[PDB]
């Protein structure tokens, strides 16, 4: 890796693998939670 | 030495609750 190298140049790479499972979520997006409502028809979202 | 396993060594294949069902 000389600075004079275009695809010959160094590239940094990060690979994000999501441990997506039907299991306890623990990394989540900035979306805020509501209070909980019961015994009424509701448009829910639990952990995505 | 040896023995027979019988029906040992079954485990929950995924973290999903199921009930009254014959899953495969």
Say if residues A13 and B7 touch (Cβ distance below 8 Å): no
Report resolution in angstroms: 3.3
- The alpha carbon of residue B5 is apart from the nearest alpha carbon of chain A, in Å, by 30
Helix, strand, coil tally for chain A in percent (to 5):
0, 0, 100
Residue with tokens 């199921």: B18
Cα(B14)–Cα(A38) distance, integer angstroms: 28
- The alpha carbon of residue B8 is apart from the nearest alpha carbon of chain A, in Å, by 25
Query: Within 13 Å and on the Cβ side, how many CA atoms surround A45?
Result: 7
User: What b-and-e string marks burial along A2-40, b requiring 16 or more CB atoms within 10 Å of the CB?
Assistant: eeeeeeeeeeeeeeeeeeeeeeeeeeeeeeeeeeeeeee
Q: What angle do CA B4, B8, B11 make, to 5 degrees?
A: 155
Q: Does B16 touch chain A (CB under 8 A)?
A: yes
Residue with tokens 């499972």: A21
Sequence-separated (6 or more) residues with CB below 8 Å from residue A29: A48
């Amino acid at each position: 890796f000389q600075p004079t190298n275009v695809g010959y140049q160094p590239y940094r790479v990060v690979v994000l693998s999501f441990e997506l499972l039907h299991a306890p979520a623990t990394v989540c997006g900035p979306k805020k939670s509501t209070n909980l409502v019961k015994n009424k028809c509701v448009n829910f979202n639990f952990n995505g | 030495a040896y023995t027979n396993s019988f029906t040992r060594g079954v485990y929950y294949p995924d973290k999903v609750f199921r009930s009254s069902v014959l899953h495969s």
